[PDB]
From Swiss-Prot:
UniProt name for this protein: Fatty acid-binding protein, intestinal
GO BP annotation list: fatty acid metabolic process; fatty acid transport; intestinal lipid absorption
GO MF annotations, alphabetized: fatty acid binding; long-chain fatty acid binding; long-chain fatty acid transmembrane transporter activity
Keyword annotations: Acetylation, Cytoplasm, Lipid-binding, Transport
InterPro entries on file: Calycin, FABP2, Fatty_acid-bd, ILBP, Lipocln_cytosolic_FA-bd_dom
Domain of life where this protein originates: Eukaryota
Binding-site residues, tetradecanoate: 93, 117
Record text about domains: Forms a beta-barrel structure that accommodates the hydrophobic ligand in its interior.
Binding site for hexadecanoate: 93, 117
Species per Swiss-Prot/TrEMBL record: Homo sapiens
Reported effect, residue 133 to G: Reduced stability
PANTHER family: FATTY ACID BINDING PROTEIN (PTHR11955)
Amino acid sequence: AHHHHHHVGTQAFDSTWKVDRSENYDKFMEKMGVNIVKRKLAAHDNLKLTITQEGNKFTVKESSAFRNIEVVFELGVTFNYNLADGTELRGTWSLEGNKLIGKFKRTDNGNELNTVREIIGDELVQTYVYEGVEAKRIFKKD
Ligand SMILES: CCCCCCCC/C=C\CCCCCCCC(=O)O
């Protein structure tokens, strides 16, 4: 007696999507209290994203008009992330039920930010909620 068989797959998110559009971002940056100049480049930064994962550890490369760095996280591993000005927040991402959670909190007053990751049709999306305001950026393959 004997038998055999085989198949194959291929992830979807593991791609290179660049900022093709955004929604409500204006209120998000305005909320924090960003200056006209800071809102000029942070709006037309041309964020280029590259998604690559190997297990429960994801690594994405992001580049902007004034800088660019690579970040690495782990599902369910809280770590300290620093900002361009030096602020350090304690946050990360973790899946729940059938959705992905992303939360980070300021050290000043503990402002809780909430972000979820999803994909619609042929465009990647990431939502961010700040004080009731829910803004998101739509990245299309580059
Ligand atoms: C020059 C103006 C100040 C720059 C504004 C910073 C805007 C965001 C840029 C870098 C910080 C990004 C922090 C994201 C945390 C991880 C979330 C994720 O896994 O997608």
